[PDB]
Design an enzyme around this catalytic site. Structure first.
Site, short mmCIF file in Angstrom:
data_model
loop_
_atom_site.label_atom_id
_atom_site.label_comp_id
_atom_site.label_asym_id
_atom_site.label_seq_id
_atom_site.Cartn_x
_atom_site.Cartn_y
_atom_site.Cartn_z
N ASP B 113 10.18 -30.14 22.62
CA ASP B 113 9.40 -29.91 21.42
C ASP B 113 9.88 -28.66 20.69
O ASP B 113 10.65 -27.85 21.21
CB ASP B 113 7.92 -29.79 21.77
N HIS B 151 17.77 -28.25 27.49
CA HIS B 151 17.61 -29.65 27.87
C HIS B 151 17.65 -30.59 26.67
O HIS B 151 17.37 -31.78 26.81
CB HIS B 151 16.30 -29.85 28.64
N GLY B 288 -6.01 10.75 6.21
CA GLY B 288 -6.93 11.80 5.82
C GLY B 288 -6.37 12.65 4.70
O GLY B 288 -5.16 12.73 4.48
O1 LIG Z 1 -8.00 11.45 -0.93
P1 LIG Z 1 -8.02 9.99 -1.19
O2 LIG Z 1 -9.23 9.38 -1.81
O3 LIG Z 1 -7.65 9.20 0.15
C1 LIG Z 1 -6.85 9.89 1.13
C2 LIG Z 1 -5.74 9.01 1.63
O4 LIG Z 1 -4.93 8.60 0.51
C3 LIG Z 1 -3.59 9.03 0.66
O5 LIG Z 1 -3.33 10.22 -0.06
C4 LIG Z 1 -3.87 10.30 -1.38
C5 LIG Z 1 -3.91 11.68 -2.05
O6 LIG Z 1 -3.98 12.77 -1.15
C6 LIG Z 1 -2.65 11.62 -2.90
N1 LIG Z 1 -2.58 12.63 -3.94
C7 LIG Z 1 -1.92 13.83 -3.84
N2 LIG Z 1 -2.01 14.54 -4.94
C8 LIG Z 1 -2.77 13.78 -5.82
C9 LIG Z 1 -3.13 12.59 -5.20
N3 LIG Z 1 -3.87 11.63 -5.78
C10 LIG Z 1 -4.29 11.84 -7.01
N4 LIG Z 1 -3.98 13.00 -7.71
C11 LIG Z 1 -4.30 13.42 -8.99
C12 LIG Z 1 -3.74 14.66 -9.17
N5 LIG Z 1 -3.08 15.01 -8.03
C13 LIG Z 1 -3.22 13.99 -7.11
O7 LIG Z 1 -2.77 10.34 -3.48
C14 LIG Z 1 -3.12 9.44 -2.41
C15 LIG Z 1 -3.88 8.27 -2.98
O8 LIG Z 1 -5.06 8.73 -3.67
P2 LIG Z 1 -6.46 8.32 -3.02
O9 LIG Z 1 -6.23 7.18 -2.08
O10 LIG Z 1 -7.49 8.16 -4.09
O11 LIG Z 1 -6.82 9.63 -2.18
C16 LIG Z 1 -3.40 9.28 2.15
O12 LIG Z 1 -2.91 8.18 2.89
C17 LIG Z 1 -4.79 9.69 2.62
O13 LIG Z 1 -5.03 9.22 3.94
#
Ligand SMILES: O=P1(O)OC[C@H]2O[C@@H](O[C@H]3[C@@H](O)[C@H](n4cnc5c4ncn4ccnc54)O[C@@H]3COP(=O)(O)O1)[C@H](O)[C@@H]2O
Ligand SMILES: NC(=O)c1ccc[n+]([C@@H]2O[C@H](COP(=O)([O-])OP(=O)([O-])OC[C@H]3O[C@@H](n4cnc5c4nc[n+]4cc[nH]c54)[C@H](O)[C@@H]3O)[C@@H](O)[C@H]2O)c1
Ligand SMILES: NC(=O)c1ccc[n+]([C@@H]2O[C@H](COP(=O)([O-])OP(=O)([O-])OC[C@H]3O[C@@H](n4cnc5c4nc[n+]4cc[nH]c54)[C@H](O)[C@@H]3O)[C@@H](O)[C@H]2O)c1
Ligand SMILES: O=P1(O)OC[C@H]2O[C@@H](O[C@H]3[C@@H](O)[C@H](n4cnc5c4ncn4ccnc54)O[C@@H]3COP(=O)(O)O1)[C@H](O)[C@@H]2O
EC number: 3.2.2.5
Lengths: 473, 473
Positions: B113, B151, B288
């Site tokens: 198969d 086989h 994070g």
């Molecule tokens: O914190 P959160 O809600 O979630 C956190 C998670 O997301 C990802 O990292 C973020 C965020 O650190 C990064 N980031 C860096 N600098 C800026 C920015 N985003 C928007 N900006 C406007 C002006 N400057 C910035 O852009 C990712 C997307 O943005 P979000 O997912 O909305 O971020 C990781 O994996 C983290 O685990």
């Protein structure tokens, strides 16, 4: 003499063979008189092993197929049987030797034995034996004949066509042999000897040739023995078998194969001997040497020899002469007059002047034997030379006569010319049955007239020509 | 948890597969739970036609050979039977899907198969299926695994190894496959699943490998179910069968093949799931973003993240990070400190910074899903960003948690870090059995300790590491 149908067949087939456009198709029956046991006798234990009886069986191919089926398709026993039987050392029959002596360059055999090959070998002929598809791609140099063993060889039993599987796969495996046999059947005149025409492969090939050529098929010949009344059979059964054989022969004639019905199997040997004699006697050995031409004058005898040679050439005879003193020049002149009407064909006139000196006389005997071997009829004229100023009967003509007799050649001494020719004529007339056994009245009359001095040039030449023709034809 | 022998086998074979030096030998028994009827059931009319009974027969190869013998060696009926049965459309079992998901590049199958091929296809993997000697000379480009159907294939029933003739001619016809299987047995670690070790070809190959390598044979594994007491059988017969099976396993050890005895056939699925989990959970998704590090100071939290990443790298974990603002730099620093002792291996640290702008946010969701798919364990830290000058709990971490749950990934929210991590920890503790079914006391204690603010950096890191290790190991 034989039946008028047999005589017509002999004439036509001698004509075909002399043109070197004739082939021989030999079946297993041609080897059944040699000493090989019958195939049914070999299959008798094979039939007994599967519970059948070979005497009650007519299709031995199906019997062998049943035996193979009972043994998961294994052919070892049958291969061993055929190898043990058909590889034995057996003395050649006269038919094989005559066929080897004939100028036939094509043999097609359904027999596994090597009797045709051995017969060709014993005649110092090169035989190109073919039983494999690969072997068709190579040709022996200076070969005299080619033998197609279309059912296999004895030394290769596993490839022999014996069972129904072999016949069913023959059209695929051995297709080049089918094509070759079709080409030979459409391009050559075949003689079927020892063939029962019950072979599926031959039936298939003949049906294909017939479908291809309609009524324009080439005529072939077969030799079949008439039905014989068995001791147990009744008259009605014998007549039924005769009618069945007649219907069989008229259906082979559907393939444009004319059948010659023979009373017995020795008539095959008689027919072959007659064809061989007709081919061999067409070459005449003209012998003699003459300083004094007996009663006739010099010019008269020269004209006689010239016209005799011209008639011999005109009657489709090939003259072989030793260029004897006093006879050679005029036979040469006659041949030239007959042919220059042109070039000297090597077959029509073979000239073998004897070497002069002590070295030549050492090999003179072998030279004479080789010269005479080319002929089948010896004609002797005069036989007188000059040794010490006197006409003495020659001795070379006597040696030539002895060699001709030792080679079973017909001797035609013309006693009217005298000298050694007259002595030889007297010797032949002393024991006529020894040299001409079973001679007719016309032959005796011509031989007696050969020693008539009252005949003119034309009458003596006509007598000699008629004697030689009844010897040949 | 399973038997300690099973646990040792799981550890060793996970180690073998992670090195990509493991092969799977699947017998017909691996496809007997899919829906294909038993081969004895298929041969039941075949056995009845030759007058035998398939239930009274144990050697079905000899039964098929007898059937072919009764039919002059014809296999058309058996070919039609196998084509009709094993070419049906059947839903894949869980074992085939798990094996396809595992990083196994070599399959050897005695089944006709195409279940392994279909399982590899449904995983978007390129499978190079080989059942002909010619197919060994060509390799598919960018293939994930090669399947040797030793086989034959179902779509080529005439070349399937079913009868004694096939086994007897296998050593000549399929010699390259024998050489390939010998090379794999000496160069790869095999797992035999669904194989009864009653195949003459496998016995021949194993005997040759044993004769070649003596006591230095490579260790292989087999999975065999223990004997079960049949309703008709007595206690003595059951004990005799158990002893016979024990002797059969020691003999297999003669070929350095260790046998794992399983209570039932679902333990094969359990073992495969455990191996898949051990392989998948070795990659941790660190998530994070933090502007304010809850109670801990900035430098203290940075050192905590750095040492946590260093410990994760030291514990043979592959870190995948989205480079979140405030967390990405320090996990990068920890990985660099752990590895520069050197170059950054692509497997140890996969960095996926999010594109910035309007175009990036369109594909941000697919980017996040692709990033998370590479991992089997998700670790969440903090989860606070800055939007309008004030610390606001992030929303990307929540999406990451949702994606991790949708992919059945283990989630390890550290509540001591606070913000979205604390919210996720509270949510997990609200329904603990939903996320961690059948959790032990130690796992519950570690999960509860994950939300302790009184722990130091070392204590919290050790708690996280132990939780992730008991999840993986
Ligand atoms: O914190 P959160 O809600 O979630 C956190 C998670 O997301 C990802 O990292 C973020 C965020 O650190 C990064 N980031 C860096 N600098 C800026 C920015 N985003 C928007 N900006 C406007 C002006 N400057 C910035 O852009 C990712 C997307 O943005 P979000 O997912 O909305 O971020 C990781 O994996 C983290 O685990
Ligand atoms: O196979 P096949 O189909 O080639 O021939 P067959 O069926 O084996 O042999 C059957 C044939 O063998 C032919 N036959 C029998 N005996 C003789 C003979 N011919 C000549 N001579 C000379 C002496 N004896 C014989 C006979 O002519 C018959 O046709
Ligand atoms: O030699 P072979 O390759 O031809 O195998 P065989 O003799 O056809 O099948 C016999 C083998 O099939 C094995 N076997 C039976 N049922 C299952 C099984 N293994 C796993 N599962 C999972 C669910 N069901 C099963 C069982 O382990 C036995 O060794
Ligand atoms: O006559 P014959 O007995 O037999 C005759 C038969 O022989 C052959 O021709 C003879 C002969 O004509 C030829 N020949 C020619 N010139 C001389 C000579 N021989 C000896 N010479 C010495 C001096 N000059 C000659 O030499 C052949 C051999 O000599 P012989 O056989 O002894 O000759 C034919 O075939 C002829 O049929």
């Amino acid at each position: 003499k034989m039946n008028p149908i047999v005589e017509l067949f002999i004439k036509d087939f001698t004509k075909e063979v002399m043109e070197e456009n004739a082939a021989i198709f030999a079946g297993a029956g041609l080897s059944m008189s040699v000493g090989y046991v019958s195939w049914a006798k070999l299959l008798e234990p094979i039939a007994q092993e599967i519970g059948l009886d070979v005497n009650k069986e007519n299709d031995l191919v199906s019997l062998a197929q049943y035996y193979c089926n009972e043994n998961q398709g294994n052919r070892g026993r049958i291969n061993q049987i055929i190898l043990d039987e058909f590889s034995r050392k057996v003395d050649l029959t006269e038919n094989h030797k005559i066929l080897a002596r004939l100028p036939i360059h094509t043999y097609w055999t359904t027999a596994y034995d090597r009797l045709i090959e051995k017969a060709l070998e014993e005649e110092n002929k090169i035989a190109d034996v073919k039983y494999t598809v690969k072997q068709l791609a190579t040709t022996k140099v200076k070969r005299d004949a080619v033998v197609y063993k279309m059912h296999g060889d004895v030394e290769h039993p596993s490839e022999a066509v014996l069972i129904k599987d072999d016949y069913e796969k023959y059209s695929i495996k051995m297709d080049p042999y089918i094509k070759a046999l079709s080409g030979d059947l459409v391009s050559k005149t075949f003689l079927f000897v020892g063939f029962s025409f019950t072979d599926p492969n031959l039936d298939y090939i003949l049906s294909r040739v017939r479908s291809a050529y309609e009524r324009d098929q080439r005529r072939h010949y077969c030799l079949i023995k008439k039905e014989e009344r068995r001791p147990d059979e009744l008259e009605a059964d014998f007549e039924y078998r005769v009618r069945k054989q007649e219907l069989f022969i008229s259906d082979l004639s559907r393939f444009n194969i004319k059948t010659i019905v023979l009373n017995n199997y020795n008539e095959i040997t008689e027919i072959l001997q007659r064809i061989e004699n007709n081919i061999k006697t067409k070459t005449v050995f003209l012998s003699g040497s003459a300083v004094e031409y007996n009663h006739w004058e010099t010019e008269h005898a020269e004209q006689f020899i010239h016209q005799l040679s011209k008639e011999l050439i005109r009657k489709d005879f090939n003259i072989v002469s030793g260029f004897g003193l006093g006879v050679g020049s005029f036979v040469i002149n006659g041949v030239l007059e007959e042919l220059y009407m042109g070039t000297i064909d090597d077959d029509r006139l073979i000239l073998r002047p004897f070497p002069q000196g002590k070295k030549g006389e050492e090999q003179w005997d072998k030279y004479r034997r080789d010269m005479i071997t080319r002929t089948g009829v010896s004609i002797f004229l005069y036989g007188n030379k000059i040794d010490k100023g006197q006409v003495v009967k020659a001795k070379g003509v006597q040696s030539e006569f002895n060699i001709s007799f030792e080679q079973n050649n017909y001797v035609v001494p013309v006693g009217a010319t005298g000298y050694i020719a007259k002595d030889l004529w007297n010797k032949v007339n002393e024991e006529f049955e020894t040299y001409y056994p079973g001679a007719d009245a016309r032959m005796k009359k011509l031989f007696g007239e050969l020693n008539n001095e009252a005949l003119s040039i034309e009458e003596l030449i006509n007598t000699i020509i008629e004697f030689v023709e009844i010897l040949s034809n």
